[PDB]
Amino acid sequence: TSTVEFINRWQRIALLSQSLLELAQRGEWDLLLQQEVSYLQSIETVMEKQTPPGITRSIQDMVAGYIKQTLDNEQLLKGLLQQRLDELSSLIGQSTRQKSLNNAYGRLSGMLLVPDA
């Protein structure tokens, strides 16, 4: 029926959300980055679908729970992401030795008393 199809569609997204939560909980960002484009294109498709006629409050609740499940992994993800963004952004900063080095290079580069033999 169109009602199980409705439910199932959202069961499908609920899964993918939980899918990426892992692609990050474990460490696969190279992957996760690829599968997000889809997960998004997926949430999008299921939204321009036509909600069946005979929807009952019971069903409405079932689907909503899935969406909640989804929104909940979506917040865990965002957290882990901001966390990885954090420690990485931490690396660039400490190392503005570019000046220490550009200084260490420029200095040596401009010596005038340097003999040769």
Contacts (CB under 8 A) with a second copy, residues 64-103: 64, 67-68, 70-71, 74-75, 78, 81-82, 84-85, 87-89, 91-95, 97-98, 100-102
Question: Percentages helix, strand, coil for the chain, rounded to the nearest 5?
Answer: 80, 0, 20
Nearer CB in complex with a second copy: 1/56: 56
Nearer CB in complex with a second copy: 4/64: 64
**Is residue 44 close enough to count as binding a second copy by CB under 8 A?**
yes
Annotate 8-65 with DSSP letters as a single string.
HHHHHHHHHHHHHHHHHHT--HHHHHHHHHHHHHHHHHTTSSPPPTT--HHHHHHHHH
Name the amino acid, one letter, at 72.
D
Cβ atoms of 77 and 24 within 8 Å: the answer is yes
Tell me which residues touch a second copy (CB under 8 A): 27, 29-30, 32-33, 36, 40, 43-44, 47, 51, 54-58, 60, 63-64, 67-68, 70-71, 74-75, 78, 81-82, 84-85, 87-89, 91-95, 97-98, 100-102, 104-105, 108-109, 111, 114-117
